[PDB]
Amino acid sequence: EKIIVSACLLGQPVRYDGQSKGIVSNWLDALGAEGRALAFCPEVAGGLPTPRPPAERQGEHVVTESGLDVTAEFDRGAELALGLCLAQGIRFALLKEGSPSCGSGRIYNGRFEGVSMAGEGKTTALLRRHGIQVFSEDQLPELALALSLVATA
């Protein structure tokens, strides 16, 4: 089976600051070598540029510090992630922690003050609502196990 992965976790320079969040993982490298780790960046897919200003959720809305509302792009990117999972038969996602799109256990609190809180990004929320299990880069053993359990079926 294949998984969808935040493109930044695969070393792609698609982060809001033009950086990457490439993780060191023999398991993830091997999965990619087998063609089973499909890269996806909801913000770029949703039409946002790179670089782009930091954004935080404010409930259903997603805004930048200047007040620009980018919810349209965030929601488009989330739908496109779901569309790729449905088309490819994907039921597991490995998404970047803390992001207003990809966060799964934590997100910034919407006050633009460097304070995190329990929560999830727009893309994680939509995927979970449709039965797709989302794991962060802090849960690689858990994700690898979940994917391994269905291997011989």
| Residue 117, both tokens | 């809180």
Answer for which of 2, 6, 31, 90 binds ligand SF4 (CB under 6 A) is: 6
Q: For residue 16, state whether it binds ligand H2S (rule: CB under 6 A).
A: yes
Smallest gap from residue 141 Cβ to ligand SF4 (A):
21
Smallest gap from residue 144 Cβ to ligand H2S (A):
24
Any residues with CB less than 8 A from the CB of 97 and at least 6 apart, and which? 103, 104, 105, 106, 136, 137, 138
Q: For residue 15, state whether it binds ligand SF4 (rule: CB under 6 A).
A: yes
Say if residue 43 carries a ligand binding annotation. Answer: yes
Burial class, 28, CB count within 10 angstroms (exposed 0-12 / middle 13-18 / buried 19+): buried
Other residues' Cβ atoms within 10 Å of the Cβ of residue 11: 13
Residue with CB nearest ligand H2S? 16
> How far is 132 from 71, CA to CA, in rounded Å?
22
Say if residue 142 carries a ligand binding annotation. Answer: no
Say if residue 41 carries a ligand binding annotation. Answer: yes
- Interface of this chain with ligand H2S, residues 21 to 60, rule: CB under 6 A: 43
Q: How many residues lie near ligand H2S (CB under 6 A)?
A: 4
Task: Give residue for tokens 């858990």.
Answer: 142
